[PDB]
Amino acid sequence: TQNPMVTGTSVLGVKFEGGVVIAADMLGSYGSLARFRNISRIMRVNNSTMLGASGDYADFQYLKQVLGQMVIDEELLGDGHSYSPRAIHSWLTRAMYSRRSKMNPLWNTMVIGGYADGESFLGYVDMLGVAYEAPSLATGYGAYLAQPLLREVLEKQPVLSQTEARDLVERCMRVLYYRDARSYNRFQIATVTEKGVEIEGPLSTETNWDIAHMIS
Amino acid sequence: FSLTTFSPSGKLVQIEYALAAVAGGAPSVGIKAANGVVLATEKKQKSILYDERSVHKVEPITKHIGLVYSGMGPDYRVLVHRARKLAQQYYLVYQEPIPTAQLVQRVASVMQEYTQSGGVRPFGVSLLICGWNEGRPYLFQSDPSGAYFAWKATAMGKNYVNGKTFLEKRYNEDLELEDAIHTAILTLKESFEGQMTEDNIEVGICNEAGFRRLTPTEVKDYLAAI
Amino acid sequence: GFDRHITIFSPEGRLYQVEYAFKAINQGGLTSVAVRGKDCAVIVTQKKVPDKLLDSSTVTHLFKITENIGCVMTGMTADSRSQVQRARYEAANWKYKYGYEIPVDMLCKRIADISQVYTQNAEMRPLGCCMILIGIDEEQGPQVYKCDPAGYYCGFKATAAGVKQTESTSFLEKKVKKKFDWTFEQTVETAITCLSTVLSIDFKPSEIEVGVVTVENPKFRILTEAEIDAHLVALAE
Amino acid sequence: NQYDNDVTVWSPQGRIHQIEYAMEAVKQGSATVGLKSKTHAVLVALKRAQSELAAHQKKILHVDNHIGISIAGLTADARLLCNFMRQECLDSRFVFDRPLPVSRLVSLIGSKTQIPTQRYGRRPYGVGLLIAGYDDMGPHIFQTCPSANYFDCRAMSIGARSQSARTYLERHMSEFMECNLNELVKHGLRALRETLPAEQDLTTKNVSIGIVGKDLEFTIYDDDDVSPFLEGLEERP
Amino acid sequence: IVKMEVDYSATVDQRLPECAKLAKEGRLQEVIETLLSLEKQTRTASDMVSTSRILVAVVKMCYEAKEWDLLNENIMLLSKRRSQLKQAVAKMVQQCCTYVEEITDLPIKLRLIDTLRMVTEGKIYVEIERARLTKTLATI
Amino acid sequence: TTIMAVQFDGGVVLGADSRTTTGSYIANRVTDKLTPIHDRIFCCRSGSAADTQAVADAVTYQLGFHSIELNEPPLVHTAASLFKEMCYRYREDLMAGIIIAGWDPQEGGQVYSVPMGGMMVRQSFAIGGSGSSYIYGYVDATYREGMTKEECLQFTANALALAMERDGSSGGVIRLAAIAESGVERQVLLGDQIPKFAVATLP
Amino acid sequence: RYDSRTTIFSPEGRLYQVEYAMEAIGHAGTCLGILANDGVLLAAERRNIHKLLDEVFFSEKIYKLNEDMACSVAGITSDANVLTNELRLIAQRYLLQYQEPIPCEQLVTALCDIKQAYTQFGGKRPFGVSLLYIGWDKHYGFQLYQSDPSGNYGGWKATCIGNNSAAAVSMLKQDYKEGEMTLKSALALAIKVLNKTMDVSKLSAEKVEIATLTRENGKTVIRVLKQKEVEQLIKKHEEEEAKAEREK
Amino acid sequence: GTGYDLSASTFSPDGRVFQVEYAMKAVENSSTAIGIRCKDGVVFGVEKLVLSKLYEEGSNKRLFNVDRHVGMAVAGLLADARSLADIAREEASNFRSNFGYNIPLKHLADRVAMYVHAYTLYSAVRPFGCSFMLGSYSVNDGAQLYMIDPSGVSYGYWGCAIGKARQAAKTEIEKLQMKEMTCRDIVKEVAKIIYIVHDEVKDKAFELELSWVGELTNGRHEIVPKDIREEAEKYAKE
């Protein structure tokens, strides 16, 4: 709300041909403290939309509860329609804008991934209500470190394949773990596609320290 | 409408019906003696199933203000709860006046939320109040619509007419000591049908020392030798 | 007119709405008995279950208001449930506002005040359900009270409510006039034989639901099928 | 008849009478038909004229690019419902940038109108609504009666003497999914023409058309816009 | 009186004579108790013929094993348990009447007065009174 | 002060210090920080003592009422939800770290953490309070899986003892609470019974 | 159908509810105010004089409502109490606002405005009470005002408001003389008219309650004449009656 | 009644609420429904009268989904029924938001019933003209099914029916032997019972809306797949 106490570190995500993949590590940073190491920052909005957040995990849990409740209410009617990930991104955007207008901001930067109508969508909304969609997205220090690699890959390859896309995401996670104080070597990777949303789980990245011998 | 209402041309028909209901049947005599005041009433429970130490007809609203009532006991509770809150608020605002008899008139006056704001249905209870924190006693009556009457001796029961006649004939008088409670019990006897006993009759006394609801031991003691 | 249609004083000087509302309790076809004892307080009501498609597990008329107070309702079940919910709210709110648990007499007083507010005013109507709530109170022994649609809360030792409440009260008056205290067996047997004499069906141990609060064992024990059967066997012996 | 006086009161025979009277408000109004298709929804409304000098009034109200309604009944509390539906659709546009699906809109209207049917001093919204919308599941036609019980329909008509139009729609409804836009509009025009007496006949000034399709946003055609549909009338009054 | 719920005719047929063999001389009371449980089951199932047969078998076992006291308290318990089925108890009293008249003995007076006490709890005009009349004549 | 919870098979074990600090003076050296929210559910409080007490009492209200209206013991998850809602709606005003634990027949021994901010998480073990930040390495290294009741009791007692001896805001006595289907057993470690790792630095 | 009160007109155009209340004000109660130079006084009739009262309120009809005025009701006591409380509140609110005693006319106008509102809007009963006021101000000196439940007050100088108000006012008109009127002769006139309107001759001093407002040295003194002074007035009146009757 | 049956706040001289006594009549008049607790779940069923073929495929369905695992089969005045279903959905959402997890069916039924009773207590508002079954299943609490009448209270039902023909349905329901029959055969039998109840003898053709909840659906109260339950409707027809 006003001053977060337990903050979640960066989250990123890239869309590919026919689906999207996002990744978030499982650390809840109580400042400089790795207090919670087994928490999930990725939520299944519905069968065909995923969401991750970086920042106050309490605010993330509140948004998860509210959004899951509204999705359940939407599916209760049985009208055949659903909350398309575009609509979900718009709804989060407004919510965040309403909170900033009320001057009780939600300390979370959110990445919304989805694949509906045969076309992938990958939204982005922050605390200050700024929202847009880009083929690659990252939050916090992720947008400083992992984002450039995504940009330089996508400039030469506007479209992507799933396997190399998730490999790129894993490499970006490795970079973030290498050069981010708040990061941790345990990240979940969630893939949305026509078949639905599948979350891998407590994946880990291999660390290289050969340069450790270059100190002398 | 949502107040004490239903007043036709020169009448208060709803209030008159309320008084017809307050005719009641619990005699509940009151006597203002020189030393203090006695409020005695009849607790004639249906059968022996009910209890007498469970519910009371005499309620100490504060340190030396005691209260007895008439028909519509459910309304009387609410009324005595309101009265306790009112006396407490007055004592809290005007802090530490040990207010009972300089407060007895005032609480009788603040018994306007009593009836001047009836509450769609007016209250159906007439209540006698006793206080002795002025060096002098005070016995007041508040009726389902009127106000403080400042009695010296009265009754509010089914036979309140002949009860009051008995009070005046037995000379409520002015020199009567505190033990006019004997005369109060006699007045009840008149409006009583049975061998009255300690649990059957409930009486409170308010003298200059304070107010106290007499326990069955003392009530039976007084009933003996009658 | 409308003297008998709204909650207003009758010209004769009576209140006909609550007088009607009391007969609503008799309406619904049920009876309930409560007996205070030397140390315990046991109540029992018949369980009229038409057809077995219902769940006899949840058709009950007795409830726990708090950890030590148990109530039996009599009358329209919707109002009965509403007042049970109100009593539970009052018990929890009392435990929150003041540390110690709410005495049964105080709880009955608050419920009676709510009902008295209902019979006051004219927008709402009184709830047609009379509630007999019992519980162990320290320095008081067992305690039984009855709040009624009017607001008059009292009732003790032996009190009954329902259609055939008068006959039960008469029998219980005979029993209490018979000067002998009931132990945690005579009290139960007295309640059982009272209700059985009221509605002679010999009371197969499935059509009544009895609640018990002893002193050495607090809490509102809704006695099970086996316990009521054991008491019935011991009584009919 | 006492029991018919107020909306809140309930008739001894069953359903209340004020609601049943409220449907007569929509019965006493100019006729309107609305039919679905495989891909389009079309409303044909008989614009009832006061006198030849005055205009034929307005029917087929506009709500959003993909939803348009046709009123039949009390015009007073009908622009109110139009405001409510417009506001809800704009709220949906504002929150998640997607057209509010019609079924959700109709459920909202039903819930909104249900409350006056139970709140004292509030008359029910005696307006017959023919909502035509294009959500993601093809065209939709919904009928909302003042009793707040909406219905989905392949083709439904409401208004004075609308039973004849209902019968024609029922008898021809088998051949409704596979019809060109003009064919379906002429179906609706024949259905509406069968309503008014034989002396009356369709004119460009006394009819209104509301068309909403997959690529065609809701449009209100009339006289000039209507003549191309009015051609090929096959006039059998 | 009340509709039958669960019959146990097959159970009694298959088990009662086996129980009689198992307690031919009546030294076992577990057999009496388990037939009591079976007849309680049939009573809660509201069956009259099975309960009557069980009671008749019990009194027949008591006859053949000639335990007069255990008969007295056994029939007391049977008549006082919950009252059971009026048809069944009237039957059992009838076979007790048929039995007490054949053995002279000294304590058949005790048997007669025991059955008199069992039947004098009421239910005289209803559910057999000729048995009580014959018992009084036998006492004479 | 320090508070800690561990989940074992068929129950949980809670350990709390008895010290509550005000500036540098010991306000209450025998503080009872294991508040029973219900019969089989306990709360460990840290931070603003007044705020913790108010939140715990309000939750005890709501939870007891909810259990009575269900005629069933409440879930530890339900209790933790009540705490997270209470803390999250008033986080800007209420600053308190709460460790909830207990046993219910639905799942068994459960432990949840609601620190300042109003987040809920289910953990095998939970740790909080001012003195918690000094035993993270020990509690993480010396925790096994499938530890039994006595193992968890001794391990939590040791962790609290070291947190007390290291942190300046923690001291006094240790309160342990073993929660299981059989019930709750509360014990107090004081004085010599405190497990001590003496530091005899050589001269 | 729900009950609705009557704050409406007549086919002719009369407010018959208000008129009935105003007429009922005549029924029950009896007060009269007589204005005189250097002193204006009120006389009230003690309706119920049962021997079982104690008379500890010290005043039933006459109410002190302000330092410089005093009123007397003749209506239903339930409304009278709240009206007196509101009147005192109004006077004291004016005193707070202007740091000056409230002029009697302004006070009466405020009260009659509240009664006019009570008879004007909403489903509220009219205040069935009519009251007199005697007061002193800086601008007009001694003033007397009479307010009816209609809210249409009037500035009187010799009036009555009770049951036989017609007889009392006729007596006042017959034996009232302005200017010459003084406090003592005003008292004689008041007791005489009260004796006329109360059938039992030789009125006991207990059945009559009278209060005089006088202007001392820059200060208004409102003295309720106690029993001895009242009965001495009665004795002087009796001497006058005997003398006048016998001298014929 | 005559004088006393005008507002629910007016008690009868005998002590009855004739407003609710009349609101029950609307439920008695409206078309029927049925719900059976199978061995491992609850199966609903309700015939819907297609008053005119102008209507599309089954709309204003007497079934509703109030929560993820809870379903509501309603009969009576359909508009107020839908508003009450919305009340139930809001209640379930609020309970999930406050206490987490899913709302137990007994408590949900109790809360909605207390809400209904609030609407019959007063005078300005009128009693709801609907009666509905709430059915749910979970692994922990098995399958529960509570019926709420227009003014009464929830009651645990092994099998219940409401509407035009309650007794006719209940006879064959009690004939059916539940508590050991799987939800599949129960889904067949409920259609059988509805078709045994009159559908066209005096009325139009009827639609068979059937609902499911149970471990075969791992909770998640959903409408039975109508394409594959058309054969169950056929078996009912035979």
Coordinates of C-alpha atoms in Angstrom, one line a residue, chain E residues 6-91:
Chain E
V6 CA -37.4 -55.8 8.7
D7 CA -38.5 -59.4 9.0
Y8 CA -36.1 -62.0 10.5
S9 CA -38.1 -65.1 9.8
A10 CA -35.2 -66.7 8.0
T11 CA -32.8 -65.8 10.8
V12 CA -35.0 -67.2 13.5
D13 CA -35.6 -70.4 11.5
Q14 CA -31.9 -71.0 10.8
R15 CA -30.7 -70.1 14.3
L16 CA -33.3 -70.7 17.0
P17 CA -33.3 -74.6 16.9
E18 CA -29.5 -74.5 16.8
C19 CA -29.6 -72.2 19.9
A20 CA -31.9 -74.7 21.6
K21 CA -29.4 -77.5 20.8
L22 CA -26.5 -75.4 22.0
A23 CA -28.3 -74.8 25.3
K24 CA -30.3 -78.0 25.5
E25 CA -30.1 -78.0 29.4
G26 CA -30.0 -74.2 29.6
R27 CA -26.6 -73.9 31.2
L28 CA -25.8 -71.0 28.8
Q29 CA -27.3 -67.6 29.2
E30 CA -25.4 -66.1 26.3
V31 CA -27.9 -67.9 24.1
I32 CA -30.8 -66.2 25.9
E33 CA -29.1 -62.8 25.6
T34 CA -28.4 -63.2 21.9
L35 CA -32.0 -64.2 21.2
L36 CA -33.0 -61.1 23.3
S37 CA -30.8 -59.0 21.0
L38 CA -32.4 -60.6 17.9
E39 CA -36.0 -60.0 19.2
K40 CA -35.0 -56.5 20.1
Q41 CA -33.9 -56.0 16.5
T42 CA -37.2 -57.5 15.2
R43 CA -39.0 -55.2 17.7
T44 CA -37.3 -52.1 16.5
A45 CA -38.3 -53.5 13.0
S46 CA -41.8 -53.8 14.4
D47 CA -42.3 -57.5 13.7
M48 CA -44.8 -59.4 15.9
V49 CA -44.6 -63.0 14.8
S50 CA -40.8 -63.3 15.2
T51 CA -40.9 -61.7 18.7
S52 CA -43.7 -64.0 19.7
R53 CA -41.8 -67.1 18.4
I54 CA -38.7 -65.9 20.3
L55 CA -40.6 -65.5 23.5
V56 CA -42.3 -68.9 23.1
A57 CA -38.9 -70.5 22.4
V58 CA -37.4 -68.9 25.5
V59 CA -40.2 -70.1 27.8
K60 CA -40.0 -73.5 26.2
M61 CA -36.3 -73.7 26.9
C62 CA -37.0 -72.7 30.5
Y63 CA -39.6 -75.5 30.7
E64 CA -37.3 -78.1 29.4
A65 CA -34.4 -77.0 31.6
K66 CA -36.7 -76.6 34.7
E67 CA -34.9 -73.5 36.1
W68 CA -37.8 -72.0 38.0
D69 CA -36.2 -69.0 39.5
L70 CA -34.3 -68.0 36.3
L71 CA -37.7 -68.4 34.5
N72 CA -39.3 -66.0 37.0
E73 CA -36.7 -63.2 36.6
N74 CA -36.5 -64.0 32.8
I75 CA -40.2 -63.5 32.3
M76 CA -40.1 -60.5 34.5
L77 CA -37.4 -58.9 32.3
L78 CA -39.3 -59.9 29.2
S79 CA -42.5 -58.4 30.3
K80 CA -40.8 -55.2 31.7
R81 CA -38.0 -54.5 29.2
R82 CA -40.0 -52.0 27.1
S83 CA -43.4 -53.8 27.0
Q84 CA -42.4 -55.2 23.6
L85 CA -45.4 -56.4 21.4
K86 CA -48.7 -56.9 23.1
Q87 CA -49.5 -59.8 20.9
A88 CA -46.2 -61.5 21.7
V89 CA -46.5 -61.0 25.5
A90 CA -50.1 -62.2 25.4
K91 CA -48.9 -65.3 23.6

